[PDB]
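Predict the assembly for these six chains.
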Amino acid sequence: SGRKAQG
Amino acid sequence: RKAQ
Amino acid sequence: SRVKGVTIVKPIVYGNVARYFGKKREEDGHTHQWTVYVKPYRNEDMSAYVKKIQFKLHESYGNPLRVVTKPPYEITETGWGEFEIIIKIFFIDPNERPVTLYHLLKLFQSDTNAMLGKKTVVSEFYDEMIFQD
Amino acid sequence: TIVKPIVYGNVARYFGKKREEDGHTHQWTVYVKPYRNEDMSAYVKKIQFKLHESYGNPLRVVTKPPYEITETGWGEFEIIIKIFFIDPNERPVTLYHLLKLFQSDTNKTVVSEFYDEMIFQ
Amino acid sequence: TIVKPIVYGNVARYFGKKREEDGHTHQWTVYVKPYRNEDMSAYVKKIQFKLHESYGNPLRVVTKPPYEITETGWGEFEIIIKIFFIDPNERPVTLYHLLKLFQSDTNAMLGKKTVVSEFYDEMIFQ
Amino acid sequence: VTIVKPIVYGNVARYFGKKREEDGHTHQWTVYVKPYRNEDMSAYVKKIQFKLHESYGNPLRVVTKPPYEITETGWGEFEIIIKIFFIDPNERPVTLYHLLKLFQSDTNAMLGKKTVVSEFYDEMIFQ
């Protein structure tokens, strides 16, 4: 979410 | 001095 | 800041290493362990001139502001996501403002390195700290 | 004059056997990366990888690192790699890479990669 | 006026099967290395690792990198690491390391199979 | 830019499956000098000599354009003398010494590390 990304 |  | 004393230059590396758990942990969804760090470029004692290094994490972390006052200047955590860490390096009190670095935490291995079987993800950069002795 | 070194190429690995549904035999990844760690997106807008016409979506585009495309296949072919820059008036650079799947005369995972330089200003 | 940072500690891996021929259950390696890579042999003459008295040859000495000793066993014990310097005017430094073999309950759920116990220190000259 | 020029040097190595029967070689290795940053080192480096063990043909290898790397196969470790020559004729050549590492440490073998890396650091300053 937001400035934090999964991958 | 020494264990498991 | 007014310049007091001799201005000196100290090279550093900074960044992170990370490793995949191999499965998503159900309790919190975390998938990786990572360590973010600042090191001198050569093998020397940075505590002679570094007072503390602060690592500001994403607000999804319960305490986002980690302060390290003695070497090694590193923080190890687990998580699921990549985000920007703000690193502030404060020097011994001849001087005032910190050096601010930005580091994008790298967790996810590239497809290339995955095919090569590389187990650790590393993202490291060079910089030069300029401050008063 | 500013020179930015890159390496481009591909890795590939043979499946166990030929896959029966599509006859593919290898997984491969084609890539462009800086020679030393740096975030190329500061100056690279996008990299497009033009694959063989036998692929659906032969024109693949990557806008953020890692600049890599992963696929499966069964034959070797030339990939045209086109690097587009954020700076206008900066000609895109075009690279030609022969995708390598099979092991060579002189050498598990096949690697074929090359050093190059991008020239600026 | 010279301080040289080091890291020391051990790695260990469970056999999988308890070796019945001797009762050993783990392989382990104890080590010392510079914090940032450099030619430590330029100032280190040798590093002595003193093991538990249950080992035949409890004194192990390494004189070139990597400064590491590998063994097998069943128990955790305190290893005494003595670092000798090229300069005979420099007294040796002694470090103590508790060998870690058994894994934390955190680290099964994470998904690691190798135990690591590692510490930072600093060697000071005059 | 950057005030000093950081460099890395040393080697990587990879063990073959087994000993190659023809020559008894066991490893492929690459010895190198690189800038730490993604920059063009040829802007200040004219050539780099890598002096290999006498068991190699033409043991004085010279690399005049980037990348400054030599890839070979082998079976034993030995000291390589690296000599860096500079564009500026007033900059004296710099000599580095490196033990070519083939054998993985037991520590690194116990972790998952299949590649051997022996990397060292230096800094140069240019007017």
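Chain C is about 5% helix and 50% strand. Helices of chain C lie at 111-115.
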